[PDB]
């Protein structure tokens with residue numbers, strides 16, 4: 001089995017897995033919609049009672065399966081629990097990262113195309129009216145991804161966007177095809193430091209933004225000022241947990257797969273804690289200090305919150321660049337922004353394709369080259385659905401990146417810490433650890449976490465079950481049908497692997 005070359009490389013690889021579009025796009029929006037500081041408390045709690053324990057659990061399962069030559073859940077679940085249904089459940093550790101990868105890589109290609117156009121300097125040129133400043137950039141984005149005028153089911157992506165998507169796929173492939181140590185680790189050691197530097201620079205530049213309408217400092221205060229009136233709002237807790245899952249790459253089967261390449265004897269405790277911590281630093285300190293403080297700086301708090309509620313891509317791809325365009329060297333600043341986004345995105349995407357690749361290698365005994373090329377083929381092909389179908393992206397992000405990750409986190413935790421046994425699991429986690437997990441967490445993993453997740457899922461289901469059946473748009477039914485198809489496909493591949501074993 002292939003292994004990480006150095007501990008540093010491992011850390012930066014995992015951190016590259018975690019740190020991504022979720023930090024600089026999803027987070028600012030989530031925190032803004034949820035009332036700034038009010039969102040932080042639950043967030044932190046969700047980080048302590050969910051993110052950390054599940055992170056350690058996934059590292060442990062990953063290394064455990066890796067020792068035996070298995071980096072994916074279909075096999076690992078079976079090692080931990082002997083059942084066919086364990087394999088069937090294991091299918092989600094493929095389906096989820098694949099589905100998420102499909103749209104994620106596309107958004108990444110967006111960040112790339114924008115990076116290029118802003119570098120070369122082809123951008124809308126604004127003239128004191130907010131709508132006259134934002135409108136050009138809204139039209140810019142809409143022309144890029146081909147957004148319809150009314151609400152219409154069909155998207156018309158520009159040729160440039162498509163070509164850039166091809167290029168992005170090519171970069172992902174060029175990285176993944178060199179393997180764990182050579183392809184992924186090498187790139188991590190560069191992309192990560194680059195990312196941190198760019199992020200710091202942007203944070204500082206943004207912090208200097210002050211106008212008659214407000215300041216970046218106002219945004220920082222808004223984000224860091226506690227509000228206890230929202231603590232009774234379940235939605236805030238749900239959003240916090242969802243964000244924790246998404247940003248730490250939990251429930252995507254990615255962490256597990258990366259961990260399967262960690263040598264049996266190497267420490268997963270301090271490495272894991274370090275990766276998670278790095279992610280949170282990149283999220284709250286970096287991600288939260290860029291978009292929001294700038295928006296608040298120019299338009300004030302209320303307007304910034306309104307913009308955040310407007311959409312996830314509205315703050316990142318429209319508002320921010322429009323704000324930069326009003327400053328000296330704003331185009332170049334926009335470029336830096338989109339380049340940062342692109343590197344974070346890439347470092348995540350490779351991580352979410354790796355599970356499929358690793359299944360093809362381990363279970364079907366395919367060579368790395370073939371596994372990578374076929375994974376790329378599948379992702380690229382499926383991506384046309386997200387490209388040409390309006391609202392498809394949201395559907396995938398919902399079923400896979402929202403519900404699926406929580407369900408799968410609960411499932412993996414239940415299999416590892418309950419069925420496989422709690423003491424054996426604990427010992428497996430602490431084994432080889434440079435430092436040891438605080439005893440209290442044993443009780444957090446076994447009782448608190450699973451209960452919390454179960455409650456969450458119950459609430460969610462309660463709310464969504466009625467809504468699902470009545471939904472008007474056909475695009476979503478097409479998407480659902482297709483991803484169900486993907487699930488059947490993966491299940492079939494698992495069947496084939498199982499048969500090959502015998």
Ligand SMILES: C[N+](C)(C)CCOP(=O)(O)O
Nearest residue numbers: 081082083084085086088
């Ligand atoms: C009954 N079941 C389908 C849930 C489990 C069967 O697993 P197995 O005994 O065939 O391995």
Ligand SMILES: CC(C)C[C@H](N)C(=O)O
Nearest residue numbers: 018020021022247249348
């Ligand atoms: C799906 C995951 C790889 C996403 C990543 N953790 C992020 O924060 O963007």
Ligand code: NA
Nearest residue numbers: 018019020247
């Ligand atoms: Na993240």
Ligand code: NA
Nearest residue numbers: 019020347348
């Ligand atoms: Na990343």
